[PDB]
Amino acid sequence: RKLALKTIDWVAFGEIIPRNQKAVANSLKSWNETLTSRLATLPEKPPAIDWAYYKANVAKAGLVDDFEKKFNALKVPIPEDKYTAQVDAEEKEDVKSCAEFLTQSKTRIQEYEKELEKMRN
Amino acid sequence: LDPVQKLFVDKIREYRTKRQTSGGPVDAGPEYQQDLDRELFKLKQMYGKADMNTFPNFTFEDPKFE
């Protein structure tokens, strides 16, 4: 429903925890699994009442019918974000990860390989 | 039978007279009403605790800004 795999993730996750969150992720993994199995189970929506039987055969229908109208008119919101600029601090952390490590390290490796030439000998 | 439909008539008559009236229940007095009240309480617990004649309100949830 709500989640998905992105990359390689529930396994590939847990092992690997950037130090600036590292400790958190260990705890967070197990929390997530709890949410995962829970959500998958729940019902998604109930039935929606057979009015015909109830209206006819609950003959206090002044009450029933008024409550009916209020129920049928009854509108519903959604839950709330709170925690999803983490989603976006992601693209930031993704810079840090590649370019910030990618680049500096690629220049480092540049030297290690050029030095490989002579030390064949 | 038909001499036994003579009794069946009798009952049908009393049912309407009551229904279009009431005296307590016509034939029942407070005693009916009192018994109901003893059953009526226990059923509230089986059925919830309120809102029995009035639509349930709801509330909505929050988070932590991190």
State the nearest Cα–Cα gap between B50 and chain A, in angstroms.
14
* Method of elucidation: cryo-EM
Sign of CA dihedral B23, B27, B33, B36: negative
Enter the tokens of residue A81. 């974000």
Question: Nearest-CA residue of chain A relative to B60?
Answer: A79
Q: What CATH number has the domain spanning B1-48?
A: 6.10.280.200
Is residue B64 within a helix (H) or strand (E), and if so which, with residue range? none
Angle at A105 between CA A99 and CA A107, to 5 degrees: 100
Phi, psi torsion values for B43, nearest 5 degrees: -70, -35
The resolution, in Å, is 7.2
* Partner residue facing B65 (CB), from A71, A77, A82: A82
Helix, strand, or coil (residue A50): coil
The chain B residues in contact with chain A (CB within 8 A) are: 53-55, 60-66
* Partner residue facing A83 (CB), from B53, B61, B64: B64
* CB contact at 8 A, B41 and B49: no
Judge whether A88 is closer than 8 Å to chain B, CB to CB.
Answer: no
Chain B interface disruption, residue of A28, A49, A80, A88, most B CBs within 10 A: A80
Question: Nearest-CA residue of chain B relative to A68?
Answer: B55
Helix, strand, or coil (residue A62): helix
Question: Which alpha helices (DSSP H) does chain A contain, by range?
Answer: 10-14, 22-41, 51-57, 61-73, 89-118
Helix, strand, or coil (residue B7): helix
